[PDB]
Design a protein around this nucleic acid. Structure first.
Lengths: 1208, 501
RNA sequence: UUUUUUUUU
RNA sequence: GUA
RNA sequence: AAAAAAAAAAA
């Protein structure tokens, strides 16, 4: 087709016919697999070999499309690439190829007898090549490539760009596709066996390179360099060669920022504010420049020489800090694939979970008080790193002992108890004992504890857990390895719960941690933005390689002594099956056996410490049951991060106290640890800071950790957020729009479009051009997520087609004999993407009736019920305020097809699918299990709440099931049970319940309007007065503080208008949050608040029964009383907008900050909640329409129906 | 009210030496507690083995104040039944729940009693060496108080004020029970029977107790015998119950032997060993391996050879055994050969005690380099002077645990554990916990404790006692008790209890 | 409280 | 374009 | 198909 020669290709606006054509053509590319092969491949496209354009700054750069010979003509399969051991018990120890090797896709044959070791190995390589390469997030992989190619075609208006030549050179094999993925077989079927083996992943690689071109990160010549690099990496083995130079091609930027040598940067305050700009040298110290020689040598002898030439070009031709940021983002796009890296876990086990000893050994502390089986109860270090850690960690034990005593631990264990998967699976004896529905539901963890609640107080439960092995489970993550992680059962989780409780209480007593301090916005980077605007600073992101694996048993003993000191000082009886008693004991010096009083928590901690077995046991399909060597951290426990946080802060602060005791100063200001990520910030002269950094790295080496010293003057890394000189450098290639880890491929479509919106919002202040990413998201939502197949009963098939085909198209299938129900699709119009509870995507200029277009919705626009305003905005509100009408102009909304979209939203498919699953779970067994589960902690409260609920039911109407506190455990078990299956005649009743709603809905449909959307109508007029820019518009013009914050951009100008985010300036907080949503925490359309308000307008003496049946505290009682009194008096208006904190990453949350930009006449304040309401109006309009905001002052005109609605 | 009901489970209390006084307020109280146990066992079995309101049951039984009477009924029907039972007792107070401080007793407490413990102040009776003391209130009221006959205490029962209905007899005379019974007139009485022994030795620092799982006829020892006499039975079945270092040595003689209760094996030890035996039996696992750590001088090879023999005879397979100093005696001969032989017969041919270890050579050179050549010179140092040398010995240990070269320890155990001709199941020994990442991949690893003062056993042997004591102290400094502590009788009971075929 | 989703360890 |  | 932390929506 010719999809780059449309009206939308040259105007980018939705007129009457441009919208019709772009709906006709994208529905062509979604339905048939014949037109996609014609779209991606056609003889009108002429291939290019040499090419020339500009790089990411404007410098001319030349490149050449070079396919290697190893991708075009692959070799035959070599069985020596995956060897085995001599006994054939596992793969070889030092085997090279840890991932999929490039070979010919038909060369992997299986000529062995079944039930043979080599037959198992070749069946598992079949499983790797055909199944573990399909990872698509939204649609089929050839539909996710047509979206990228179509978006590039409509943006650049041509076809002679090199990514089309890469598509044609790599995938035009015959008159069909080389391969396809089938959801029926859950694997990829190769049509041409002569194609390569890694070749199905280059679909996702081409999708990611096109996403980076849409980002503004790569140009077309840089896309040639990137695709040459990714085809060079697949010459031997793709993932191995990617991981081998994964950090070499990134860490050059420190040298480029050195060779710039002069930067004018923003200056950040102590209070999250831009207060100045300064000019300073970026020249690194003498000990940093000595690493540049080694990195130059390794960069010269490892990389592909075109990419090495590009890195030397970036080091040589960069003049400012922005040039270094642009080349660094381009090399991030050239080194990362944007795919999830996965193979067989029998391959990646020995490199992801195998324990290792890197540095010197760790010794033991002297046991001072010992069990009668000679286990340790109390122990203290003589000298080494243990004394160093304990000299800091032994001044908090006396306070954590007080904090742990005021915690009811059985209620903490029930609240901690998740609906995730437990370790062990019930065998046939217990499956015969409990019912069949319970045995089906027992893949949860809370149902598991409710089954085995009879022996929670029995001590042999713990020893029964030591007979069961620990299951291994895979993960997938972009840019990193596979990370085989552990999953352990209820009792091994229960042993590690009290050290989790003890080590968690350290977070409230200092500021070394980062667990409780995140928000999703620029408060995550407050410390890094503040401590890079200073001088005489040394910044340090020390890299502990393999924190989970390098921790031996004797390294865990450093945490064990801290836990045993806190447990010996406290007094906690009745933790689990353990209780306080006079316990016979051995001491030091005492020849005989003493007797001391040992509480329950210290028994649990000592038995957890002295019975340690880490080794995960994966059951393979090749070798049977594969185990691991002992000595890893178990990494699936409850204390899997508090351990690392406490241990690292103990080592660092103990080094600080040891240096203070050795006569040396300490110049360390802050550390921030989340486990495996330390961030050290020093301040002083170069000798002092370098000495303290070398001492910290050496004392981490003393504890048995291979560190990588990554320290500098101007850059800092913590939790994958780079801050270089008061400036965020986002990682845009870490977000994978096209690949997916779990590969559920969710059967829900509104949820899929919400997932796409979440990813697109997370790619906002790390992308360089958000308009191209908007257009990419539009075409992926308009090609990938159109059609929706559901199974419809045979007696209702043509009836549902005849009811539904009146507004949008539908797709039919074959009638399928020897079965009952056949499936049918639900291809939808493009106006579903723009509506509330539909797509909720930022729209394009729609032409009105009068020829004037709608305004271009930016990337900062709201979502939720605010998106209903597009109906009135295309219905010409400017005419509505002067005609004094609320006529929605349904004819134009039928010309654009909004009415069928709102019809499909009003069908409400997913709620019916969920309710027919809810209509099966038997409440008798759920009640029995949760009554068995209530008996573990905090008795009397559930029964008192249920007594108050039955009392309010007998002297009132009713209360619902979830909202009552006594039924919340029953509700959580029942909701964990219903998420199990959908396999059967529940689908027939899906087809039945969806049949009766479409009979009632498709008589005749016209758009219903409330009185409550009379406040959606309103407009703004542009005056001639230019507003004044915030004074940090001159400070943030040099060295933009994100990739789209550049001088003149929409993010920069919105930041210059609205200003930064503030935590102190909460001008209007009650009214804004109340008409947005919650009064304090309880939202208005929340069933707690709705049932409470229904009781509130009833007899008010029932509130004494209500607050006991819900079991709210006195402050929550006062909050609900004030919420009732505020919802009755003038809680009648509400607006319901949604803005995500990642979407406004530097901008302000508070709508008050847009008051200085809009002149509202004072004859419109006729109610006490007009000011906050109008500030919401002006704030959302100024964020929605930044792209045409040249800087004039606005003026809000209103509608008389709006004023009459606000009055009453 | 005990935790385990003495009227139903009378034989378990007979095992502790606690006999029921024949059938008064205590006689009424024990029957009332038995009826309470039957009522709780009935109420537990109607709701998934749990009790519906355990604080209410605990108050009504232990405190004896709450009365529930119907004058919902369904939720409180069990409590009304328990209330009408307890109200018919007319006790002045409540029946206190009574637990012993033994491990074998707590594993046999029922589930409903364990649910009531968490809302009750129990009466926890201590144990001396497993026997609960007889000078308590409840064990004097409900049971027969024992009376011990010795060589000096031996007389007719008319001489003391003994009686069949109050006192039971503990024969500690070293004579047959029939001779005491029909020679002195103890025929109407009843004897408590114990199956093990309790031996007091003459230690270096004091006197040392020992508990053995053999009868006094099975264990051929009398008062005044020797430690090296019948050493194998003591190593296989004995546990010293004193603080280590307990100065036991090859010169210690017997002061006293008394009949005493057999020790009960631990839960976690038998759990980890049955996990290993499940790995041995199942066809799903290609290589089974047990990792055993012990201090250097615990006599671990002599027992684990017997363990490999018993496992081979009971399982029908071939069980190998790699010694603790296997890698050192291998590397002493093969550190110069670039391409050595990793075969199992060549490794097993070098585990004899005449081959010199590599680590003993390096530690010999390290002790020479400080001028330490006699044991008295090493004893006369300070602790910091020892630790300064042990850190250099750790510097020479780390070079073989750091990487995987062609002579690394991890490569050695990889090549022996994954050979063509090697046995399937290996019992591999080790010295210190940093070898967990190096010794072959398992899911069972234990720690072995025997009756050997390992700092005394290494100064009582030739061939360089300085190096042996130094390496013992270094390996102790790298070995906490952070895996499951296992005694040798537990390792034999693991095979005796696991059912084969 | 559940379910879904994203960033991160 | 299943079962 | 584990654990922790922060963020958005629905019944």
């Amino acid at each position: 087709t010719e999809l780059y020669n449309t009206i939308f290709s040259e105007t980018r606006k939705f007129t009457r016919e441009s919208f019709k054509e772009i709906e006709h053509l994208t529905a062509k590319l979604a339905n048939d697999r014949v037109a996609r092969h014609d779209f991606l491949f056609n003889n009108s496209i002429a291939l290019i070999s040499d090419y020339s354009g500009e790089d990411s700054n404007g410098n001319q750069l030349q490149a050449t499309v070079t396919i290697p010979n190893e991708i075009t003509n692959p070799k035959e399969y070599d069985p020596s690439d995956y060897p085995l051991a001599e006994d054939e018990s596992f793969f070889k120890q030092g085997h090279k190829y840890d991932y999929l090797v490039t070979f010919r896709a038909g060369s992997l044959t299986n000529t062995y007898e079944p039930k043979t070791k080599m037959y198992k190995l070749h069946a598992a390589l079949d499983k790797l090549m055909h199944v573990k390469q399909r990872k698509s997030r939204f649609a089929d992989l050839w539909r996710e490539l047509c979206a990228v190619i179509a978006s590039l075609d409509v943006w650049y208006q041509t076809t002679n760009y090199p990514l089309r030549t890469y598509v044609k050179l790599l995938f035009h094999k015959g008159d069909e596709f080389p391969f396809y993925e089938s959801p029926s077989q859950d694997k990829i079927i190769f049509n041409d066996k002569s194609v390569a083996s890694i070749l199905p992943t280059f679909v996702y690689t081409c999708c990611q390179v096109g996403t980076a071109i849409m980002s503004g990160i790569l140009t077309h010549v840089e896309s040639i360099v990137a695709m040459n690099h990714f085809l060079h990496c697949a010459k031997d083995s793709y993932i191995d060669e990617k991981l081998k130079i994964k950090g070499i091609g990134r860490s050059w930027y420190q040298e480029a920022l050195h060779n710039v040598g002069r930067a004018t940067v923003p200056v950040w305050s102590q209070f999250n504010e831009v207060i100045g700009h300064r000019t300073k040298t970026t020249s690194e110290p003498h000990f940093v420049s000595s690493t540049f020689i080694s990195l130059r040598a390794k960069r010269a002898e490892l990389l592909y020489p075109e990419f090495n030439e590009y890195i030397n070009r970036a080091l040589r031709l960069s003049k400012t800090q922005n040039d270094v940021a642009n080349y660094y983002a381009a090399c991030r796009a050239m080194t990362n694939d944007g795919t999830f890296l996965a193979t067989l876990t029998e391959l990646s086990l020995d490199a992801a979970v195998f324990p290792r000893i890197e540095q010197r050994l760790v010794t033991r502390p002297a046991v001072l008080m010992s069990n009668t089986r000679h286990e340790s109860l109390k122990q203290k270090y003589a000298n080494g790193v243990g004394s160093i850690a304990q000299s800091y960690l032994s001044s908090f034990t006396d306070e954590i002992a007080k904090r742990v005593n005021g915690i009811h631990h059985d209620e903490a264990w029930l609240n901690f108890l998740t609906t995730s998967s437990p370790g062990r699976k019930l065998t046939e004896i217990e499956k015969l004992e409990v019912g069949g529905d319970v045995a089906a539901w027992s893949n949860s963890r809370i149902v598991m504890q409710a089954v085995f609640a009879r022996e929670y107080r029995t001590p042999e439960r713990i020893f029964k857990s030591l007979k069961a092995p620990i299951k291994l489970v895979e993960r997938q993550q972009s840019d990193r390895r596979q990370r085989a992680i552990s999953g352990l059962d209820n009792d091994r989780l229960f042993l590690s719960f009290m050290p989790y409780t003890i080590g968690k209480q350290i977070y409230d007593l200092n500021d070394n941690a980062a667990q409780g301090k995140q928000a999703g916005n620029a408060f995550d980077i407050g410390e890094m933005l503040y401590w890079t605007s200073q001088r005489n600073v040394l910044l340090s992101s020390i890299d502990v390689a393999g924190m989970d694996a390098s921790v031996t048993t004797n390294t865990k003993d450093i945490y064990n002594t801290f836990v045993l000191d806190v447990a010996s000082k406290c007094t906690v009886p009745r933790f689990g099956p353990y209780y306080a008693k006079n316990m016979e004991v051995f001491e030091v010096g005492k020849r005989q056996s003493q007797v001391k009083y040992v509480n329950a928590a210290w028994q649990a901690c000592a038995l957890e410490a002295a019975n340690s077995q880490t080794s995960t046991s994966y059951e393979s399909e090749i070798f049977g049951q594969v185990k691991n060597a002992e000595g890893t951290y178990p990494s699936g426990r409850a204390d899997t991060s508090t351990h690392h946080t406490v241990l690292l802060q103990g080592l660092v602060r103990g080094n600080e106290l040891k240096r203070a005791s050795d006569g040396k100063n300490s110049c360390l200001t802050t550390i921030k640890i989340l486990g495996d990520d330390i961030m050290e910030i020093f301040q002083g002269n170069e000798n002092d800071t370098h000495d303290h950094a070398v001492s910290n790295a050496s004392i981490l080496n003393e504890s048995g950790f291979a560190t990588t010293a990554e320290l500098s003057q101007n850059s800092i890394v913590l939790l994958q957020q780079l801050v270089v000189n008061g400036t965020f450098w986002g990682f845009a290639d870490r977000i994978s729009l096209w690949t997916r880890e779990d590969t559920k491929d969710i059967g829900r479509l509104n949820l899929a479009m919400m997932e796409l919106n979440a990813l697109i919002d997370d790619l906002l202040f790390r992308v360089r051009r958000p308009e191209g990413l908007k257009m990419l998201g539009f075409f992926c939502g308009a090609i990938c997520l159109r059609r929706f197949t559901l199974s419809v009963d045979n007696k209702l098939y043509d009836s549902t087609y005849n009811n539904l085909s009146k507004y949008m198209t539908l797709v039919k299938y074959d009638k399928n004999p020897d079965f009952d129900s056949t499936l049918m699709s639900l291809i939808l119009p493009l106006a579903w993407l723009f509506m509330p509870r539909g797509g909720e995507y930022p729209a394009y200029p729609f032409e009105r009736r009068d020829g004037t277009f709608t305004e271009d919705e930016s990337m900062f626009t709201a979502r939720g019920a605010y998106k209903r305003r597009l109906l009135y905005d295309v219905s010409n509100i400017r005419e509505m305020i002067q005609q004094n009408s609320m006529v929605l102009d349904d004819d134009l909304l039928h010309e654009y097809g909004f009415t069928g979209a709102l019809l499909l939203i009003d069908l409400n498919i997913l709620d019916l699918i969920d309710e027919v699953k809810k209509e099966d779970i038997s409440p008798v067994k759920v009640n029995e299990l949760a009554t068995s589960l209530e008996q573990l902690g905090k008795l009397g409260e559930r029964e008192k709440s249920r007594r108050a609920a039955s009392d309010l039911k007998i002297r009132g109407h009713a209360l619902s099931n979830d909202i009552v506190y006594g039924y919340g455990l029953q509700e959580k078990i029942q909701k964990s049970a219903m998420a199990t299956k959908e396999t059967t005649v529940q689908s027939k009743r899906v087809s039945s319940r969806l049949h009766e709603v479409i009979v009632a809905k498709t008589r005749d449909y016209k758009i219903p309007t409330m009185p409550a959307d009379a406040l959606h109508l309103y407009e703004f007029e542009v005056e001639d007065v230019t507003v004044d820019l915030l004074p940090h518009a001159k400070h943030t013009s040099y060295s933009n503080l994100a990739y789209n914050m550049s001088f003149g951009s929409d993010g920069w100008f919105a930041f210059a208008l609205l200003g930064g985010l503030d935590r102190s300036a909460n001008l209007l907080r009650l009214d804004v949050a109340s008409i947005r949503g919650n009064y304090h925490k309880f939202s208005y359309d929340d069933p707690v608040f709705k049932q409470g308000y229904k009781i509130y307008k009833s007899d008010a003496t029932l509130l004494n029964d209500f607050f006991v049946a819900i079991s709210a505290g006195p402050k929550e009682q006062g909050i609900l009383l004030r919420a009732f009194a505020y919802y009755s008096l003038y809680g009648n208006v509400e607006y319901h907008y949604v803005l995500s904190p990642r979407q406004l990453f530097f901008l302000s949350d508070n709508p008050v900050s847009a008051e200085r930009l809009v002149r509202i006449p004072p004859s419109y304040y006729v109610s006490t909640q007009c000011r906050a309401l109008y500030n919401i109006f002006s704030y959302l309009h100024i964020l929605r329409s930044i792209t045409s905001n040249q800087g004039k002052r606005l003026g809000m005109v209103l509608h008389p129906g709006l004023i009459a609605y606000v009055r009453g | 009210m005990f935790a385990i009901d003495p009227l139903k489970h009378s034989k378990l209390y007979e095992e502790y030496g606690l006999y029921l006084r024949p059938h008064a307020p205590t006689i009424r109280s024990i029957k009332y507690a038995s009826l309470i146990h039957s009522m709780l066992a009935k109420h537990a079995a109607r709701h998934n083995g749990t009790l519906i309101n355990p604080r209410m049951y605990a108050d009504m039984i232990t405190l004896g104040n709450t009365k529930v009477t119907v004058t919902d009924i369904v939720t409180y029907k069990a409590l009304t039944e328990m209330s009408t039972l307890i109200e018919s007792f007319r006790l002045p107070s409540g029946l206190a729940l009574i637990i012993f401080d033994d491990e074998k007793y707590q594993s046999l407490i029922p589930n409903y009693i364990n649910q009531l413990i968490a809302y009750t102040q129990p009466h926890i009776i201590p144990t001396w060496q497993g026997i609960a003391d007889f000078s308590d209130t409840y064990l004097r009221s409900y049971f027969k108080r024992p009376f011990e006959l010795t060589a000096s205490n031996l007389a007719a029962p008319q001489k003391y004020n003994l009686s069949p209905m109050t006192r039971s007899i503990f024969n500690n005379t070293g004579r047959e029970d029939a001779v005491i019974r029909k020679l002195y007139g103890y025929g109407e009485y009843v004897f408590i029977r114990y199956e093990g022994c309790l031996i007091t030795w003459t230690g270096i620092y004091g006197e040392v107790t020992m508990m053995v799982n053999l009868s006094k006829r099975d264990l051929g020892l009398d008062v005044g015998d020797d430690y090296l006499k019948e050493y194998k039975k003591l190593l296989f079945y004995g546990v010293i119950t004193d603080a280590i270092p307990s100065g036991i040595s090859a010169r210690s003689t017997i002061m006293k032997i008394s009949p005493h209760k057999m020790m009960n094996p631990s839960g976690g030890a038998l759990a980890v060993l049955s996990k290993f035996l499940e790995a041995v039996v199942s066809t799903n696992v290609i290589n089974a391996t047990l990792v055993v750590y012990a201090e250097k001088g615990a006599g671990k090879t002599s027992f684990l050879s017997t363990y490999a023999e018993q496992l081979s005879l009971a399982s029908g397979q071939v069980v190998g055994h790699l010694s603790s100093d296997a890698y050192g005696r291998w590397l002493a001969k093969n550190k110069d050969v670039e391409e050595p032989s990793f075969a199992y017969d060549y490794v097993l041919s070098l585990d004899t005690d005449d081959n010199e270890s590599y680590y003993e050579q390096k530690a010999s050179e390290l002790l020479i380099s400080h001028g330490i050549s006699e044991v008295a010179q090493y004893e006369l140092l300070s602790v910091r002077k020892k630790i300064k040398m042990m850190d250099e010995m750790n510097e020479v240990l780390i070079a073989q645990l750091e990487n995987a070269d062609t002579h690394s320890e991890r490569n050695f155990y990889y090549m022996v554990s994954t050979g063509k001709t090697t046995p399937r199941t290996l019992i591999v020994e080790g010295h210190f916990n940093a070898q967990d990442a190096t010794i072959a991949r398992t899911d069972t690893t234990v720690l072995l404790r025997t009756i050997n003062d390992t700092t005394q056993a290494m100064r009582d042997r030739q061939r360089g006692g300085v190096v042996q004591l130094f390496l013992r102290d270094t390996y102790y400094r790298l070995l906490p008790a952070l895996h499951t502590t296992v005694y040798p009788f537990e390792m034999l009971e693991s095979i005796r209890r696991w059912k084969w075929v």
